[PDB]
Amino acid sequence: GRMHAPGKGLSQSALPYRRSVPTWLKLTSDDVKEQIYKLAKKGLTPSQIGVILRDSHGVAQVRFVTGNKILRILKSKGLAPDLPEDLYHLIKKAVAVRKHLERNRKDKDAKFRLILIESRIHRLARYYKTKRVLPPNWKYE
């Protein structure tokens, strides 16, 4: 089921068997790379970049056409962000809830949900410190 919820939701992406590039795809590996770079400069997230490239330009899977993933391409050049996507998003959700809580002292629900977010930050931070993508002195405030 979920991390911090009783729901057993089964809703994710089902990537097809055929890894083969579609015959109708005109864009080449280098052309896609140039597109990813141009998108990345506008200040976007690998998630958003992948969605925009899937919707607009008709690239089913970047890793199939190029042979490398979005964060990996941006890492290889050096247009990758300092904090990983998911940790950054948890921190901005945490500070948003804390900003709400600072006015509302009675909102017990907000306090409970903050505790649940903080737990996700710490559990993800520990993993990133284990893989040595963050420094070992990295704390949360």
Partner: protein
């Protein structure tokens, strides 16, 4: 019950059954090409799409983001690719 070929299910039963609980996984989504009424240039869009997409040819909205599949604008004709 008791005799079904789990190996070779009938293709209509295969399509009905959930995308993740199929014998071999395949997405229900597809890639389709759009022909805008006030333009000559062709564009490709994802069946369940999430961003309002723009045709830079005439600078007009094509498909709308919805709960499921993206609703195309009136006049713009969609056709299945492979």
């Amino acid at each position: 019950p008791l005799a079904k070929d789990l190996l070779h299910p009938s293709p209509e039963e295969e399509k009905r059954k959930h995308k993740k609980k199929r014998l071999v996984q395949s997405p229900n989504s597809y890639f389709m090409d759009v022909k805008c009424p006030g333009c000559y240039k062709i564009t490709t869009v994802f069946s369940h799409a999430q961003t309002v997409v723009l045709c830079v040819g005439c600078s007009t909205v094509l498909c709308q983001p919805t709960g499921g599949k993206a609703r195309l604008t009136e006049g713009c004709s969609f056709r299945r690719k492979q």
